[PDB]
Amino acid sequence: MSLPGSKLEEARRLVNEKQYNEAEQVYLSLLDKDSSQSSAAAGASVDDKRRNEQETSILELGQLYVTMGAKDKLREFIPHSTEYMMQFAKSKTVKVLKTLIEKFEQVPDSLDDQIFVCEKSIEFAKREKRVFLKHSLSIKLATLHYQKKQYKDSLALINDLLREFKKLDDKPSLVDVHLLESKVYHKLRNLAKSKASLTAARTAANSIYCPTQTVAE
């Protein structure tokens, strides 16, 4: 706890005073410490039960990322950030990976990085785990395909979400599914079906649970 904390604080101080180049070198040390501790650097380096030490260590390891913007270091790290993720293999692992994903998406490292991380990840949720997790990520994989400006590759993906949960229909996540469909078709310049899939989005958004960001869009 003592050391993870210090490394974090120090690293943080440097980005927020000096520059990031100084903070970087501290961010190297932090990572090293976390891997060794997960696979017993002393047990956990407080001894006995893993409890807090572990919980805190994975959470400030989430603090390491996206504290260096769009950057080459961060780049390379992400197909191996997921690697660390599968090593942990605990309940709250899935939550940590979801949050991370959003953050990785949000900073811009575009075409290459986005498609590769996503692909590997979506194969990791399709095996073992739950189908519930798999499809969350599929919606994200659908969004990214549109972002590459491949409308054809994005149309094909969407059809898979579409058909499959029209027999598994009752969910808010599919209000976003229909919405996506409209964006595809917008750019194909056919407004017959851009109109049609939009009309479906509103009907299934009659359910009162929808949050501000989905309604806005």
Q: Say which amino acid occupies 199.
A: T
- How far apart CA 161 and CA 157 sit, in angstroms, is 7
Six-digit token pair at 174? Answer: 């599919």
CA distance 103 to 64: 12
Among residues 150, 185, 148, 180, the alpha carbon closest in space to that of 162 is found at 180
Look at the alpha carbons of 67, 71, 75, 76 in this order and tell me if their dihedral is positive or negative: negative
With beta carbons less than 8 A apart as the criterion, state whether 143 and 184 touch.
no
Which residue from 82, 6, 3, 85 is spatially nearest to 44, judged by alpha carbons? 3
Give the CA distances from residue 17 to residues 10, 14, 40, 153, in Å, rounded to whole numbers and listed in that order.
11, 5, 34, 45
Q: How far apart are alpha carbons 126 and 135 in whole angstroms?
A: 9
Resolution of the determined structure in angstroms stands at: 4.1
Residues 33 and 41: beta-carbon distance below 8 Å:
yes
How many other CB atoms are there within 10 angstroms of residue 107's CB atom? 15
Q: Which amino acid is at 202?
A: R
Name the structure determination technique. Answer: cryo-EM
> Counting Cβ atoms within 10 Å, is residue 151 exposed (0-12), middle (13-18) or buried (19+)?
middle
Residue pair 184/154 in contact (Cβ under 8 Å)? The answer is: yes
For residues 64 and 27, the answer to whether their CB atoms sit within 8 Å is: yes
Query: For residue 126, how far is the Cα from the chain centroid?
Result: 15
Do 65 and 100 touch, CB atoms closer than 8 A? yes
CB-side exposure of 170: number of CA atoms within 13 Å? 1
In 36-62, which positions are buried (b, 16+ CB within 10 angstroms) versus exposed (e)?
ebbeeeeebbeeeebeebbeebbebbe
Tokens representing residue 118 in the block: 């996503």
Closest by CA position to 54, among listed 123, 109, 4, 110: 4
137: which residues sit within 8 A by CB, 6+ positions away?
Answer: 101, 118, 121, 122, 125
